[PDB]
């Protein structure tokens, strides 16, 4: 972790981040579908890449999703060893089209779509606000340095190349501290039975580490 640069989120952004924090919904489960959907492409991106490139697999010839629950931590991580963001990729929006999609989304929302609709316009992301309070993104694409990304959802992101943290090789680490009320989302049984639920067939392995 080296220099911090901070950036302000687009006004469209802001706005969905606060509809997403400060609305009850009673389906926030949905936001590790919508991770786990974002990991799964991540992973086809780098096999893709390598069907024309085999050493783009050099880095890291694995490829699964793993989900990381840390009760004393408060957190849940879930990583990939999909193909990585550049720090260009994390300025503009983690790599979605947020710029246009979040402000048809919240278009979508007060017309009567529901929250879980959100992965239509590609901004599934940001659905880690129903239940994390703030979100760090450790990232490594290959052509990059290693990077994290953090915001508490007030109005800025942080960036800051990742020189001190546990070398990814590829992909990236989303680690969720998960908000005071929200720790359900912590224990394995309920992880289990949202997978369960949303997410059975998945191109990758899921992987769950449990601590004894
Ligand atoms: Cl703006």
Same mark, same amino acid.
């Given at each position: 972790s080296m220099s911090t640069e901070t950036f302000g989120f687009q006004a469209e952004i802001s706005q969905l981040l606060d509809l997403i924090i400060n609305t009850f919904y009673s389906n926030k489960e949905i936001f590790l579908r919508e991770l786990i959907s974002n990991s799964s492409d991540a992973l086809?991106?780098?096999?893709?890449?390598?069907? +024309?490139?085999? =050493?783009?697999?050099? =880095?890291?010839?694995?490829?699964?999703?793993?989900?990381?629950?840390?009760?004393?931590?408060?957190?849940? +991580?879930?990583?990939? +060893?999909?193909?990585?963001?550049?720090? *260009?990729?994390?300025?503009?929006?983690?790599?979605?089209?947020?710029? =246009?999609?979040?402000? *048809?989304?919240?278009? *979508?929302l007060s017309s009567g779509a529901d929250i879980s609709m959100i992965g239509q316009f590609g901004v599934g992301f940001y659905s880690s606000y129903l239940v994390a309070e703030k979100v760090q993104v450790t990232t490594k694409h290959n052509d990059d340095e290693q990077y994290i990304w953090e915001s508490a959802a007030g109005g800025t992101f942080t960036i800051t190349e990742d020189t001190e943290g546990p070398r990814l090789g590829r992909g990236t680490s989303m680690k969720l501290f998960i908000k005071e009320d929200l720790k359900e989302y912590l224990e394995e049984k309920r992880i289990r039975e949202i997978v369960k639920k949303h997410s059975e067939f998945i191109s990758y392995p899921i992987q769950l580490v449990v601590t004894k």
């Open positions: 086809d991106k780098i096999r893709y890449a390598a069907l +024309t490139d085999p =050493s783009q697999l050099d =880095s890291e010839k694995d490829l699964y999703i793993r989900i990381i629950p840390n009760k004393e931590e408060g957190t849940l +991580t879930i990583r990939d +060893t999909g193909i990585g963001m550049t720090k *260009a990729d994390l300025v503009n929006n983690l790599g979605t089209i947020a710029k =246009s999609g979040t402000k *048809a989304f919240m278009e *979508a």
